[PDB]
Amino acid sequence: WVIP
Amino acid sequence: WVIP
Amino acid sequence: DSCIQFTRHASDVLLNLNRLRSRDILTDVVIVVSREQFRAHKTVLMACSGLFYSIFTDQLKCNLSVINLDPEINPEGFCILLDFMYTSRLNLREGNIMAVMATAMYLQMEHVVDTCRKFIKASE
Amino acid sequence: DSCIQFTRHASDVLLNLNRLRSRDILTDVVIVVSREQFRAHKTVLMACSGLFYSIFTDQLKCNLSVINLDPEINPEGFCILLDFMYTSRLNLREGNIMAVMATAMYLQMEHVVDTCRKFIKASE
Ligand SMILES: O=C1Cc2cc(Nc3ncncc3Cl)ccc2N1
Ligand SMILES: O=C1Cc2cc(Nc3ncncc3Cl)ccc2N1
Ligand SMILES: [Cl-]
Ligand SMILES: [Cl-]
């Protein structure tokens, strides 16, 4: 999971 | 395009 | 093999599937949640959820145009997860995390269940 | 928004759509090419091809279970492109590049047409  |  | 690969292809496909969903094009099922209705593509639901995979591979249920979810399922949690299926983006907030995790467990969306568990553990 | 994003989601969705294609699950159309038949999902074809997008948004053609391609289309070129749609992998070779580019132009798959043009220009 990432900060888009 | 890339070499997978 | 000796194939070449277009890096953005999968993301572009999903973006186009979401555009078809937005315009209600070729949607073939209605998911009913606490009298809130969500139109979708069976194949996208199956590709994202262990529950929908099991439902639409069943010889009788594969032909249903309406699927009713368990009354304990929250429509907002479902809506957030449906958006995630079609975009890879999860709108996870303090106010919805419990409903989102419960819905992801029911839908069998293991990666979502994993990030919810981690976000809850960080707040304790 | 304040969304989080699962990097591998789009690729995992496409991988699952290809598994449904392999097992012939929920395929809703047959594409006929020079008497060679290919089963697929209309939504995936639309998401990948300007031609299929135009075909399945047509009020009469959206309901067809069989689509016949132009007789000049090569079945191997189509097969390579269908595999690309479901995998992001293109089996481009000296022996098939001309058929693949001609098929991609007809199907309106702009990124494939682009890499074929570049590979042809490098060999001249
Ligand atoms: O967490 C998850 C996400 C998910 C998706 C599916 N889908 C498929 N699996 C295998 N072949 C085809 C399909 Cl469509 C099954 C189980 C789970 N569990
Ligand atoms: O090269 C290409 C690839 C491609 C895909 C599509 N598909 C869609 N476009 C927009 N909204 C939904 C869909 Cl399904 C249309 C044109 C082209 N041209
Ligand atoms: Cl997931
Ligand atoms: Cl393309």
Main-chain dihedrals φ then ψ at residue C9, nearest 5 degrees:
-55, -55
Give the residue whose CA is nearest to atom 15 of ligand 1: C50
The DSSP H or E segment spanning C53 is helix C50-56
CA–CA separation, C32 vs C69, rounded Å?
Answer: 6
Question: HSE-up of D32 (CA within 13 Å, CB side)?
Answer: 7
Query: What are D48's two structure tokens?
Result: 């990948």
Between the CA of C56 and the centroid of ligand 1 the distance, in Å, is 11
Burial of C117 (0-12, 13-18, 19+ CB in 10 A): middle
Q: Is C87 on the interface with A (CB under 8 A)?
A: no
Per the structure, the complete domain to which residue C4 belongs is given by: 1-124
What b/e sequence results for D4-28 when a residue is b if at least 16 CB atoms lie within 10 Å of its CB, and e otherwise?
Answer: bebeebbbbbbebbbebbeeebbbb
Question: CB-hemisphere CA count at 13 Å for C24?
Answer: 4
For C56, list phi and psi in degrees, rounded to 5.
Answer: -85, 0
Greatest CA span in chain C, whole angstroms?
51
The rounded distance, in Å, linking the Cα atoms of C67 and C46 is 13
- The residue contributing the CA closest to ligand 2 atom 3 is D49
Residue D109 identity (one-letter amino acid): M
Phi, psi of C25 (to 5 degrees): -95, 125
Distance CA(C107)–CA(C86), nearest Å, equals 15
Count of CB contacts below 8 A, A vs D?
12
* Alpha carbon distance, N-terminus to C-terminus of chain A: 9
DSSP conformational letter for C69: P
Q: Best of D16, D20, D24 to mutate for ligand 1, by most ligand atoms within 8 A of CB? A: D16
Number of domains forming the structure of chain D: 1
For D41, list phi and psi in degrees, rounded to 5: -100, 125
CB D115 within 8 A of CB D103: no
Question: What is the rounded distance in angstroms from the CA atom of residue C32 to the CA atom of residue D70?
Answer: 42
Tokens 């029911």, residue located: C106
> Where residue C15 sits, what CATH number does that domain have?
3.30.710.10
Burial class (CB in 10 A: 0-12, 13-18, 19+), D104: buried
- ∠C15-C18-C19 over CA atoms, to 5°? 90
CB within 8 Å of D9: residues ≥ 6 apart: C14, C84, C88, C111
Using a 6 Å cutoff on CB, does residue D108 contact ligand 2?
yes
Distance spanning both ends of chain C, measured CA to CA? 49
Residues paired with residue D78 on neighbouring β-strands, in sequence order: none
**Residue listed under structure tokens 């000296």:** D94
Q: Cβ of D3 and A4 within 8 Å?
A: yes
Amino acid (one-letter) located at B3: I
Measured distance CA(C121)–CA(D123) in Å, rounded = 57
Give the gap in angstroms from C-alpha D109 to the nearest C-alpha of chain B. 14
Instruction: Measure the CA–CA gap between D19 and D87, rounded to whole angstroms.
Output: 10
C109 CB near ligand 1 (under 6 Å): yes
* Gap from A4 CA to chain D (nearest CA, Å): 6
Tell me the C-alpha distance between D91 and C4, whole Å.
7
Give the Cβ contact number of residue C46 at 10 Å: 24
Q: What is the DSSP letter of C7?
A: T
Q: Is C22 exposed, middle or buried (0-12, 13-18, 19+ CB in 10 A)?
A: exposed
What three-state secondary structure class fits D121? Answer: helix
Query: Dmax of chain D from CA atoms?
Result: 51
Does the beta carbon of C114 lie inside 6 Å of ligand 1? Answer: no
Q: Are D107 and D51 in contact (CB under 8 A)?
A: yes
Instruction: Round to whole Å and give the CA distance between D109 and D57.
Output: 17
Contacts B2 to C, Cβ<8 Å: 4-5, 7
Nearest CA in chain D to A1: D6
- Centroid of chain to Cα D24: 16
**Tokens 């994003």, residue?**
D5
Elucidated via: X-ray
Alpha helix (H) ranges present in chain D?
Answer: 9-22, 42-48, 50-56, 75-87, 97-107, 110-123
Taking an 8 Å cut-off on Cβ atoms, the answer to whether C13 and D11 are in contact is no
- Atom number of ligand 1 nearest to Cα C46: 14
Q: Please identify, by atom number, the ligand 2 atom nearest to the C-alpha of residue D111.
A: 1
